[PDB]
């Protein structure tokens, strides 16, 4: 049973540049050191989401803070999604004690933010300025803004009453990782730690009003009176506890004026202590709800976890406990309920089972009852899942597909070319990093120097340079042999790939998790990076979710009808069977056949014939049996095409500038751009294989027969009509995936301005100067197109989305689940082949990338039917800029021959067509002035003689053309040609 929960996907963010924000360093020198003799406390992470997020004029807007601690260093970074915060990275260095995992709490007050951090033997209370106290106004249309951190004046760590030292009595046992901190109802700061004898040590500091003296309390099994009464007798439950009652996990709950401390020890005894009474109250046994096993006592030393969440909608506190067991972990949920004597009690809710993987992190958002969990298993497939506790007793756990790990085998040596595959895999985004590439550059260039902070073009440049330098250093042969060359290449590129993969895994080493309960988004803290979690589409989730989870997922969320849902499930199962039958060599052959100028239907039928000839596992028989069991696939195909088809004809809604309507400040940040680009890349990479498998299955069904199913009257024609559309969509998505996986250049803005000025001097159509920003890290053609189009079209996209859903004003809670879908739909509408807008060719011309333009043209030609005249005109412009005069003239002629049947040419009025005469003559005069501003008197004379055939209604224009031909003949010194032109 499930309500409304789908699988998620991970996207790499952390902006896009290679130069991260500077870290303001602060070293704290206490006096006491940590105590060893137990579990480790290093390598931890935490986060904090602002509750006042959203809207615009309030306090925060999609902002949060996170921190990562290792041994003695602690990096605290404040990150925003809609904007980029400058100077928001602090680096605390505590050479004495070490920060405990989960001992950093953050509270808010209508004056400041109080950060309470605990260690092994020290406590610190830091005061940070509040965003609302530091003013709040976002009226000026700006992209970057400053954060709350500025210099040494914003941070403070003085006041001995605030940095109190833990006394030796009773101290703190090092055999546990427990530490909590909170603020009492009276304002006092209370820090609770596990005691050595088994009790609880409470350090109490006065509120922010007055600064008195720090007090120490020892919460034991009973009060001081009972302790003094039972002092002359051995008592472990009503006096002084023993080492077996050492709390491992701590939680707190305040009420009116008192506080209840829930301590989970290693003996599986969740004890409850009072703050004001200073005694133990209810001692419940947690082994009654979980299976009793002897393997839990060894894991309860540090593996047991406990978290709290106080929902104010009903004023109820939920405690989520996790018991670790090498056979299988256990989850438990306990709700707090009050009675009639100021004594809260825990009641069980659900007992969710867990695998033997080590729970790295777990949270539970009570705004929608979503329990998210993150575990580390045997292999590197770090599991990220989410499920509800008020639905099922076991839970199917909806997964979160992490970033695509780098592939294994690419090309075996002495058989194929491995260097091309290695370079393609290295350039494929979402599995490698610019830092990894730079470190590989430096390790292949040797020396003790550091090579960092470089553009993507120079990065790949130096990559190739040092790779071939190592190749030369390795080779000393005199006769070049194919086997030796391939061996050297595969060894060098394998070393490069393995170094990059090792650093990728080291960076992807998980630490914790961050969930936002306002705008609904999840953040994962890796090694110095922050990835985001996004919900996938319905078809993508179905294709990425196997049958084991599809059987548990209900049919109410897949489709509106049970029959349609079952048909979609069977279709997805057949696609998965085709996918697992297709190997790596088959995928490479399919990619080669799709790249080769052939027909998509012919390639699909050839692949189908090959699969039929190689079928010896009855997988095609099972696929045919599933197709026969399917009742009606027509509505399923219709739904799949409706959840994909997006197109808007004409160009009556384009906007190349930011409309000043208090909307350009929404999104537009580097983090949001990187997240959107990664999401688009993942969507394209999945949809390519999805459409390939769909076309293969459609061809298989057509070859089997469309007359042996229920309702065959509208099945034979439907497939015949949808096969060309399916092939067109597959080709379009393959081109989109190629453009997303391709690269670009990272030249400065000065080069772009110089190229634009040169094109304006040469007078080229569709050469607008658009100002934007380049990133110091990776820069691809898709990223450039996005940052150049969407950054200016957002004032229109956001204005349309505000009326489509949510609130019309700018203070609307941005629903990311619908925002990503709207962005994908708009991108599909803009990149659809049925729509014009040839902005990619103009963006390539303004960058002077003839190779990239040719690579785009050779792939757009198979699926091109509109704007052929504009494409030929852009090709002529590119050839004229390059040097191919023959190709330029041929493309100019073929574009002038077809000028009254193109959407872009018909939309571009009063510039190249119409104006004052016929559109043909207007285009002829435009090309004439283009050639005149470019040069070449012979080409100018040729274009003038061509335009003369149409210049019949303007004797003045004809005479001007004659005079131009005359002066161009006189320039080079052809007196005979000049006289011949003058005599006419």
């Amino acid at each position: 049973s499930v309500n409304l929960e789908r699988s998620y996907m991970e996207l790499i963010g952390a902006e896009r540049e290679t130069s991260r924000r500077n870290f303001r360093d602060l070293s704290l020198r206490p006096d006491v050191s940590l105590v060893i003799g137990g579990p480790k406390y290093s390598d931890c992470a935490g986060g904090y989401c602002y509750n006042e997020s959203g809207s615009l004029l309030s306090a925060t807007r999609n902002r949060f803070i996170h921190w990562t601690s290792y041994a003695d260093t602690l990096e605290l970074v404040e990150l925003s999604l809609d904007i980029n915060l400058l100077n928001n990275a602090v680096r605390l260095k505590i050479l004495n004690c070490s920060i405990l995992p989960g001992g950093v709490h953050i509270c808010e007050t209508q004056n400041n933010i109080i950060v309470l951090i605990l260690t092994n033997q020290t406590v610190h209370r830091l005061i940070l300025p509040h965003p609302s106290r530091m003013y709040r106004s976002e009226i000026i249309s700006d992209s970057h803004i400053q954060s709350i951190f500025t210099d040494i004046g914003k941070t403070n760590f003085h006041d001995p009453n605030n940095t109190y030292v833990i006394p030796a009595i009773p101290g703190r046992a090092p055999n546990s990782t427990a530490s909590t901190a909170w603020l009492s109802s009276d304002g006092e700061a209370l820090f609770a730690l596990p005691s050595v004898s088994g009790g609880i040590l409470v350090i109490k500091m006065p509120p922010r009003d007055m600064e008195g003296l720090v007090t120490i309390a020892e919460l034991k099994q009973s009060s001081v009176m009972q302790r003094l009464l039972t002092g002359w007798m051995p008592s472990s439950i009503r006096g002084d506890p023993g080492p077996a009652h050492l709390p491992v996990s701590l939680a707190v709950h305040t009420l009116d004026h008192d506080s209840y401390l829930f301590a989970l020890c290693q003996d599986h005894k969740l004890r409850m202590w009072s703050y004001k009474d200073q005694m133990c109250l209810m001692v419940a046994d947690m082994l009654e709800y979980v299976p009793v096993s002897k393997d839990i006592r060894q894991t309860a030393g540090t593996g047991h976890k406990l978290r709290l969440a106080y929902s104010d909608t009903l004023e109820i506190l939920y405690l989520g406990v996790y018991l670790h067991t090498p056979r299988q972990g256990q989850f438990c949920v306990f709700q707090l309920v009050c009675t009639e004597s100021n004594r809260y009690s825990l009641e069980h809710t659900s007992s969710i089972f867990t695998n033997q993987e080590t729970l790295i992190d777990f949270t539970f958002t009570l705004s929608s009852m979503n329990i998210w969990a993150l575990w580390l298993d045997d292999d590197n497939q770090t599991v990220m899942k989410h499920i509800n506790f008020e639905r099922n007793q076991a839970g199917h756990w909806n997964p979160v597909f992490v970033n695509p790990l780098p592939d294994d085998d690419l090309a075996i040596g002495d058989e194929q070319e491995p260097q091309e595959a290695y370079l393609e895999c290295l350039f494929a985004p979402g599995r490698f990093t610019i830092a990894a590439l730079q470190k590989a550059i430096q390790i292949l260039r040797k020396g003790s120097g550091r090579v960092l902070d470089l553009s993507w073009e120079e990065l790949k440049k130096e990559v190739t340079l040092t790779v071939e330098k190592e190749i030369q250093n390795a080779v000393v042969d005199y006769d070049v042999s194919q086997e030796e060359f391939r061996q050297i290449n595969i060894e060098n590129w394998c070393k490069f790939y393995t170094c990059c993969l090792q650093y990728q895994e080291t960076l992807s080493r998980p630490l914790a998790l961050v969930v936002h309960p306002n705008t609904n988004m999840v953040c994962l803290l890796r090694k110095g990076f922050l990835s985001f979690l996004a919900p996938c589409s319905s078809v993508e989730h179905l294709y990425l979710v196997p049958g084991e989870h599809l059987l548990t997922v209900d049919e109410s969320v897949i489709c509106d009808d049970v029959d349609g849902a079952s048909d979609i499930v069977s279709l997805i199962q057949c696609l998965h069977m085709i996918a697992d039958y297709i190997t790596e060599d088959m995928a490479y052959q399919m990619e080669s056949a799709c790249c080769h100028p052939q027909s998509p239907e012919r390639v699909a039928e050839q692949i189908l014939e090959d699969l039929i000839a190689n079928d010896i596992d009855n997988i095609m028989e099972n696929i045919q049996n599933k197709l026969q069991d399917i009742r009606n696939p027509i509505q399923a195909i219709s739904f799949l095409l409706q959840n994909m088809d997006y197109e808007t004809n004409m160009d009556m809604e384009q906007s190349q500038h930011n409309v000043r309507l208090n909307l350009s400040t929404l999104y537009g940040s580097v983090t949001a751009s990187s997240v959107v680009c990664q999401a688009i890349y993942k969507i394209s990479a999945t949809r390519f294989l999805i459409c390939r498998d769909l076309l293969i299955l459609q061809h298989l069904l057509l070859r089997l027969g469309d007359m042996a199913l229920v309702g065959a009257g509208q099945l034979l024609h439907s497939q015949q009509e949808l096969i060309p559309r399916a092939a067109q969509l597959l080709l379009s998505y393959y081109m989109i995936r190629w453009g997303s996986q391709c690269l670009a250049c990272a030249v400065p803005v000065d080069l772009l301005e110089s190229n634009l000025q040169h094109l304006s001097v040469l007078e080229l159509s569709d050469s607008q100067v658009e100002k934007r920003r380049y990133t110091s890290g990776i820069q691809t053609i898709v990223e450039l197109f996005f940052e150049d189009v969407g950054r200016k079209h957002f004032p229109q996209v956001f204005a349309h989305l505000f009326i489509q859903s949510g609130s019309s004003q700018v203070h609307r809670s941005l629903n990311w689940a619908d925002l990503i879908h709207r962005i994908t739909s708009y991108l599909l509408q803009l990149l659809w082949p049925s729509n014009p807008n040839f902005q990619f060719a103009e963006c390539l011309m303004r960058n002077c990338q003839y190779t990239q333009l040719q690579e785009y043209v050779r792939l757009l030609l198979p699926w091109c039917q509109v704007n052929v005249g504009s494409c030929h005109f852009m090709l002529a412009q590119c050839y004229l800029v390059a040097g191919e005069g023959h190709k330029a003239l041929d493309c100019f002629s073929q574009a002038a021959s077809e000028v009254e049947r193109e959407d872009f040419l018909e939309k571009l009025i009063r510039v190249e067509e119409g104006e004052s005469v016929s559109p043909r003559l207007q285009y002829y005069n435009r090309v004439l002035r283009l050639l005149e501003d470019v040069g070449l008197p012979e080409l100018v004379i040729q274009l003038a003689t061509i335009a003369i055939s149409e210049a019949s209604d303007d004797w003045r224009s004809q005479a001007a053309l004659r005079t131009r031909i005359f002066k161009h003949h006189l320039d080079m010194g052809h007196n005979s040609q000049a006289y011949d032109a003058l005599t006419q």
């Binding site: 940590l34 060893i36 003799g37 579990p39 480790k40 390598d43 290792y70 055999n175 002897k294 393997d295 060894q298 894991t299 030393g301 540090t302 593996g303 670790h324 090498p326 993987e357 080590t358 729970l359 790295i360 580390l376 045997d378 292999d379 590197n380 790990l405 780098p406 294994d408 085998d409 090309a411 075996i412 040596g413 491995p418 595959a421 290695y422 990894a436 470190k439 590989a440 390790i443 003790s448 390795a474 080779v475 000393v476 042999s481 086997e483 030796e484 061996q487 050297i488 060894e491 394998c494 790939y497 393995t498 170094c499 993969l501 090792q502 650093y503 895994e505 080291t506 080493r509 090694k527």
Partner: protein
């Protein structure tokens, strides 16, 4: 048609150097840039398909496996424990029993600090579950950590105190002190000889090398004798205890300086130290270094003592061969020139 080769090894054609389908992470490069190999940084390999390096106060591990076109390896930044007199990778060992490129199914960690507290990790990729055990060392200093079958660990202190740690199905760690040799001419050796407790009149020299043989044998080379143990799953038996404190000494002396007349006065000075121990098709090979402080300059002569080993107990034959390798001696702080052997049935020694 020769394969890939090394720039410095361009003239070598008999033995070809090839990448093992895996490299090293960038944390190793960063640690080397912070403090190059000229400082005592210790690197170790594990035939299960892994390698690690300890430097300054941090440990870095990485998987390696032969691949025709690369694969997938895991890299972790394991922080070294505190209160350590010296940093070395000989204190952390894994028990990988796989040969697949994804060799990460049965891998564990055992960190031992020079004190008496051991940290057991069920896996390198399971951060959050650690077992803190207390060995029989009150304040002694550890030295080596070996991995034996059954996922068991063997800790050795500076005085060669074999402590076997065995993990249970629940997560507990069982400790067992091995008998510190029985000998054949000294006193009682069957009793336990544990530091910070009682003593026993037996051999207790400093451990020099350890070799875990795949034929259910474990060889330990000190500075006076060689001890061969058999460790199954939960049972240990000292099968061999060959005293070689004087016989091999005079053998190496006669092999090196076997032409002088004042041998009785020359022998009293040379301090032969058996540094390496390996197993090959010929049996057991002990590499030792000898030098005379009274003869300038101090020339380090290397001697290989080979004994016939039939998979268990070694024979009575002894072949001592003196070998040199260039007059120069490169050192990362101490004179290091280690001998390695791949398989236990190959005659190739590097």
């Amino acid at each position: 048609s020769r394969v890939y080769l090394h720039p410095a090894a361009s003239e070598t054609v008999n033995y070809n150097v090839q990448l093992f389908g895996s490299s090293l992470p960038v944390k190793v490069m960063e640690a080397l840039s912070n403090a190059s190999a000229d400082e005592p940084m210790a690197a170790c390999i594990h035939e299960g398909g892994w390698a690690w390096l300890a430097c300054n106060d941090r440990l870095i591990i990485w998987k390696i496996s032969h691949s025709s076109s690369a694969k997938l390896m895991v890299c972790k930044e394991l922080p070294l424990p505190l209160s350590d007199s010296e940093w070395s990778a000989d204190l952390v060992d894994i028990c990988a029993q796989t040969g697949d490129p994804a060799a990460a199914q049965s891998v564990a960690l055992m960190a031992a600090t020079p004190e008496g507290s051991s940290r057991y990790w069920p896996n390198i990729l399971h951060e959050g579950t650690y077992i803190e055990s207390y060995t029989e060392f009150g304040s002694s200093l550890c030295a080596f950590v070996t991995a034996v079958k059954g996922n068991s660990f063997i800790l050795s202190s500076e005085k060669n105190q074999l402590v076997r740690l065995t993990p249970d199905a629940s997560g507990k760690m069982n400790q067992r002190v091995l008998p510190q040799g029985q000998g054949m001419l000294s006193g009682i050796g069957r009793r336990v000889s544990t530091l910070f407790g009682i003593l026993s009149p037996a051999v207790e020299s400093t451990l020099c090398s350890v070799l875990w043989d795949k034929g259910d044998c474990f060889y330990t080379l000190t500075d006076s004798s060689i001890n061969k143990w058999d460790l199954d799953d939960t049972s240990e038996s000292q099968v061999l205890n060959w005293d070689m404190s004087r016989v091999l000494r005079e053998y190496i002396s006669d092999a090196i300086w076997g032409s002088e007349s004042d041998y009785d006065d020359i022998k009293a000075g040379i301090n032969i130290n058996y540094l390496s121990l390996n197993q090959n098709c010929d049996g057991l090979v002990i590499l030792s270094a000898a030098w005379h402080p009274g003869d300038n300059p101090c020339q380090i002569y290397y001697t290989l003592v080979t004994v016939k080993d039939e998979g268990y107990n070694i024979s009575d034959e002894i072949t001592v061969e003196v070998t040199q390798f260039n007059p120069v001696f490169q050192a990362r702080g101490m004179q290091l020139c280690q001998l390695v052997v791949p398989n236990f049935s190959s005659q190739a020694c590097y």
